[PDB]
Amino acid sequence: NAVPRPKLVVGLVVDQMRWDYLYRYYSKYGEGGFKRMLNTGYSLNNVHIDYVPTVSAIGHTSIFTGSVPSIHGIAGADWYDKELGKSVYCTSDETVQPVGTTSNSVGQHSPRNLWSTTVTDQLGLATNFTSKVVGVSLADAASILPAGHNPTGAFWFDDTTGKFITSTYYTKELPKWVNDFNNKNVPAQLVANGWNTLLPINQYTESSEDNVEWEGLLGSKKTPTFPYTDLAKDYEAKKGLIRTTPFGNTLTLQMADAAIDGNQMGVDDITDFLTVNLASTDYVGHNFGPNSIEVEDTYLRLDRDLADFFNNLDKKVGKGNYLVFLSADHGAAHSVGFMQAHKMPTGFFMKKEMNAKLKQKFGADNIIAAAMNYQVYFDRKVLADSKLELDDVRDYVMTELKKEPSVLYVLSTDEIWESSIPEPIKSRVINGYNWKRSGDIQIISKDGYLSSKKGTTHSVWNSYDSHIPLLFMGWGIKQGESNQPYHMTDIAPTVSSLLKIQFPSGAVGKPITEVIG
Ligand SMILES: [Cl-]
Ligand SMILES: [Zn+2]
Ligand SMILES: [Zn+2]
Ligand SMILES: [Zn+2]
Ligand SMILES: [Zn+2]
């Protein structure tokens, strides 16, 4: 007689996972992980992120809010808040205390900068908060933001201790199940044998050579190569080191398994919601880039871990009784050096320099307050004190930025809709522009250009950063594939529709009807 629902839904985000990681390594995946999602669920192969910039924090926020930065407030991992006169980190919250650790900078985090509800909020609202809602990630923002404003818990990793901790936003004390998991020192176990390729290194024929100009270093190791035999001694000295190993993902998923058991997630009929961000694909990607043996081996290892993870769910909840979606919060470019190695257009993409010229032109210093997320913020204080017009300073800076080489478009964020920019870029710039927290000028780079000179990063509209995988499996989901276009903001309404719960409050997207069986 009740609304049909799965006992559990799991939201998996593989950080920095380009859609084509699914297929470039398809031949080397086992049958139980990625290939299981493809072979028993539904894959949307033409999903794009419908805002810029495609940086950290926003993708996680947008996945779970169905919303965009203009509305939901998460304008970047960091942003310049003019009324605060300083940069702000997305989850930093001075009014809470660390729980499980003594580090303020590690534990003083909360979801308070988030203006819109999440699908996890709406599930709590729909069941009168009898739902178990738990977020897990190594990184704070990727746990906190998906889990929303009133989950059962949200846990992230403490680099100073190797523990999973939280903040007093959630509870006064770590739950018993967390203390137990931490006392097993799973991280020490996982890296004890160093990091070697899971397969024999000569079979990583989808990666470049092992030693290349454009890859960075991991530990005392001073060459970008396997094997990483120093991993155990280096891990005890910097516990955050495990982030940049596949072991970071294995750790995350065992913690998630513990969350399931610790909270009795998915045993009764009240739907529960687990969110898991796999952060190590990003760390390793940032350091080595998408064509590296390191990244490939991370995805082969992640694949095995997901096979195990899905088998644990089969056992603990029952096959068919849970709903999983897997996506990414962004892709990533190829390394600049790798692109140069193969003749692809690329390059590297300012405050001190541009301020100097602005003083020699307008007669005031520190006119630019900040330059981040491909945006320029002008210092509203200096403008008013020096009697200067925002538009005149903005016009000089734009004319100056145009002649840059890496620059495709530059526009004032007051005048996006009338600029001569094609879709889908124009609407993505709108969707990403937060009036309170975003800069006064928007910059769009030429294809293939990057902002660190090793590894890679993500931020642009281009398909390599914006094209994300999206796979559903389990309860309510038919098997199949589609190349119809969809947006990152369509995931949360899909889950909402599947659960027969109200959409998140800032949602702009629509349910992907073809996955619903
Ligand atoms: Cl990130
Ligand atoms: Zn990310
Ligand atoms: Zn390498
Ligand atoms: Zn339940
Ligand atoms: Zn990243």
- Whole-number Å distance, alpha carbon 207 to ligand 5 midpoint, is 20
- Whole-number Å distance, alpha carbon 292 to ligand 3 midpoint, is 6
Phi then psi dihedrals of residue 487, to 5 deg: -120, 155
Bond into 53 cis (ω within 30): yes
Cα separation, 460 vs 51, in Å, equals 9
- Using alpha carbons, list the distances in angstroms from residue 21 to 15, 133, 302, 472: 12, 29, 11, 17
Cα separation, 37 vs 289, in Å, equals 25
Phi then psi dihedrals of residue 254, to 5 deg: -65, -40
Cα separation, 61 vs 329, in Å, equals 9
Alpha helices in 4-118 (DSSP H): 21-24, 34-40, 58-65, 69-72, 104-107
Which ligand places an atom closest to the C-alpha of 14? 2
Cα separation, 14 vs 329, in Å, equals 7
- Whole-number Å distance, alpha carbon 458 to ligand 2 midpoint, is 8
Cα separation, 29 vs 299, in Å, equals 9
Long-range contacts of 95-98 (CB under 8 A, 24+ apart): 96/167, 96/168, 96/169, 97/167, 97/168, 98/165, 98/167, 98/168
- CATH architecture of the domain covering 342-453: 2-Layer Sandwich (3.30)
Cα separation, 109 vs 141, in Å, equals 8
CATH number for the domain whose boundaries are 1-341+454-517: 3.40.720.10
195: left (phi over 0), alpha (psi -120 to 50) or beta: beta
| Ion ligand 1: residues, CB < 5 A | 56
**3 state DSSP class of 89:** strand
What's the alpha-carbon Rg for the chain, to the nearest Å?
Answer: 23
* CA-based nearest residue to 496, from 48, 43, 11, 1: 11
Which ligand places an atom closest to the C-alpha of 332? 5
| Ion ligand 4: residues, CB < 5 A | 268, 270, 272
Long-range contacts of 197-204 (CB under 8 A, 24+ apart): 197/226, 197/293, 197/297, 198/297, 198/300, 198/301, 198/304, 199/28, 199/297, 199/300, 201/226, 201/293, 203/28, 204/293, 204/296, 204/297
Q: To which residue do tokens 């809602």 refer? A: 133
* Helix (H), strand (E) at residue 286: helix 280-288
448: left (phi over 0), alpha (psi -120 to 50) or beta: left
Tell me the two tokens of residue 328: 């990414």
- Whole-number Å distance, alpha carbon 145 to ligand 1 midpoint, is 13
Experimentally, the structure was elucidated by X-ray
Q: To which residue do tokens 């068919």 refer? A: 320
On the 0-12 / 13-18 / 19+ scale of CB atoms within 10 A, 205 is exposed
Beta strand segments in 143-293, E:
153-158, 163-167, 272-278
* Helix (H), strand (E) at residue 379: none
Name the residue type at position 232: A
Tell me the two tokens of residue 364: 């005031």
* CA-based nearest residue to 255, from 184, 207, 317, 340: 184
Cα separation, 88 vs 266, in Å, equals 37
Which ligand places an atom closest to the C-alpha of 9? 4
Which ligand places an atom closest to the C-alpha of 139? 1
Cα separation, 480 vs 82, in Å, equals 48
Which ligand places an atom closest to the C-alpha of 90? 1
Q: To which residue do tokens 């996006």 refer? A: 416
Tell me the two tokens of residue 56: 């950290």
- Whole-number Å distance, alpha carbon 133 to ligand 4 midpoint, is 9
Find out whether 374 and 444 touch, Cβ atoms under 8 Å.
Answer: yes
- Whole-number Å distance, alpha carbon 271 to ligand 5 midpoint, is 31
| Ion ligand 2: residues, CB < 5 A | 15, 56, 282, 329
**3 state DSSP class of 188:** helix
- Whole-number Å distance, alpha carbon 132 to ligand 4 midpoint, is 6
Which ligand places an atom closest to the C-alpha of 7? 4
Domain map of the chain by residue range?
Answer: 1-341+454-517, 342-453
Beta strand segments in 216-361, E:
272-278, 322-327, 347-348
